[PDB]
């Protein structure tokens, strides 16, 4: 149940005070919680990041970060209707397609692309054929791992084709949802990292509140495809910046 006590608050405070002064982690500005679940969660790791909805703290607005958008084959429909809409006309730093993306960016161009952007968002029909195009730098770890979006609010039936349109209000709504919420990727073992909060865009009670939000959404029973994956007793929590130790919370 409820996880906000003096142990959690002291650990998170001491982590911020350590990362302000320590000359070994003055570049990574992030807090992750490591959930040590009881059992091994069974579902294998596809690289599709499911979305954990925070309830009362937008941790990122879609305009304070670089967004790369990856589209389908002809890309003219998505590029024009996204760039001359003025609901979405300034939201994407880049809009490209998979064919000319893998044509242009080969080798160290991918390292420059990694350092250039910080939100990779793909059309869901091309999201699966990305781990060869974007290489393994985007899939080792998870900080620039691409998100699925549906571009049209239209569903495919059998024996008939998806009519090719796109909806800029709908795609702004789901990028707003993506930047407003946090995310996780399931795996086989009992370790699971979830990003919660930033180093100066956030503070201790809101980081603690969204920590408890991710806990509730994860060990929930309903919301079962997207969130109900912790089937057993969640055993431990830790907080860490990417080069910082695992400050423990809630040892059950």
């Amino acid at each position: 149940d409820i996880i906000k006590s003096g142990l959690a608050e002291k650990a998170l405070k001491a982590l911020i005070l350590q990362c302000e002064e320590n000359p070994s982690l003055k570049n990574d500005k992030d807090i992750h919680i490591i959930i040590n679940t009881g059992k091994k969660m069974g579902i294998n790791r596809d690289n599709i990041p499911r979305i954990i909805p925070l309830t009362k703290y937008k941790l990122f607005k879609p305009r304070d970060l670089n967004i790369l958008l990856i589209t389908k084959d002809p890309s003219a429909l998505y590029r024009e209707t996204l760039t001359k809409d003025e609901h979405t006309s300034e939201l994407f730093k880049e809009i490209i397609s998979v064919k000319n993306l893998r044509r242009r960016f080969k080798g160290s161009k991918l390292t420059q692309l990694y350092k250039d952007f910080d939100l990779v968002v793909a059309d869901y029909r091309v999201h699966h054929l990305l781990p060869e195009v974007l290489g393994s730098r985007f899939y080792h770890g998870s900080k620039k791992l691409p998100y699925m979006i549906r571009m049209s609010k239209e569903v495919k039936l059998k024996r008939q084709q998806m009519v090719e349109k796109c909806d800029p209000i709908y795609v702004r709504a789901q990028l707003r949802s993506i930047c407003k919420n946090t995310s996780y990727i399931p795996n086989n073992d009992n370790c699971l990292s979830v990003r919660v909060g930033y180093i100066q865009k956030h503070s201790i009670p809101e980081i603690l509140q969204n920590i408890q939000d991710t806990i509730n959404f994860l060990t929930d029973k309903s919301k079962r495809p997207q969130g109900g994956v912790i089937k057993g007793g969640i055993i431990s929590i830790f907080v860490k910046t990417s080069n910082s130790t695992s400050l423990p919370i809630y040892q059950f």
Binding site: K10, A11, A14, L15, L17, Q18, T245, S246, L247, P248
Partner: peptide, 17 residues
């Protein structure tokens, strides 16, 4: 100080094992 407490804790846990 709690930072150094817990990193010494995991260090001496591994040393004890």
């Amino acid at each position: 100080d709690y930072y150094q407490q817990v990193q010494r804790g995991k260090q001496d846990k591994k040393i004890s094992r």
